[PDB]
Structure 1
């Protein structure tokens, strides 16, 4: 079977500008496991981004967590870009501070 990734970008602790914090991209609900997830600052890729170990929930769907350290500001934009088999064009989900 296949199933489409669900995505949630958030920070680890309440965002405060100028403070370092961590940017998280939670991907889950997918199957196949092969997935490319990249965290974008202002459109560009952050390398030096890590993920967790691939596990699966009760329905054999995989989940994964990707994170970098970031320091919010009002000017930069942040997002996650996920691409996987079930999607025709990769979803980009932009980090809104209030969720």
Structure 2
């Protein structure tokens, strides 16, 4: 069957300011079929109770979802998104980079 691997972007809702509460977002898009596993990570560990948008799709039929959680960034803490999909042999980890 023809399958499509996810694009992944990790970013904040607002420009990051250390000590200021924000939302961390992992946007997955362009994938098919729709089953996908997405975790948000803080210092390598899974954040609990992450929420996500309702499944929808683009004009080319590929799916997209936004995973998000409230967070307060600091200098020390590292954040990332970890994604698995049938098209991926291993999970893909994308690090949060404030300038991206």
TM-score by length of 1: 0.99
Give 1:78 deviation, angstroms: 0.1
Partner Cα distance (1:7, 1:31) in 2: 14
Deviations 1:1-37 (A, max 9, x none): 2000000000000000000000000000000100000
Partner Cα distance (1:36, 1:47) in 2: 14
Give 1:71 deviation, angstroms: 0.3
Give 1:48 deviation, angstroms: 1.3
Give 1:91 deviation, angstroms: 0.6
TM-score by length of 2: 0.98
Partner Cα distance (2:48, 2:66) in 1: 15
**Size of the alignment, in residue pairs?**
99
Deviation beyond 3 Å, 4+ runs, structure 1: none
- For structure 1, list consecutive stretches of 5 or more residues without a partner in the other structure: none
Query: How large is the Cα RMSD of the aligned pairs?
Result: 0.5
Deviations 1:65-94 (A, max 9, x none): 000001000101000000000011111000
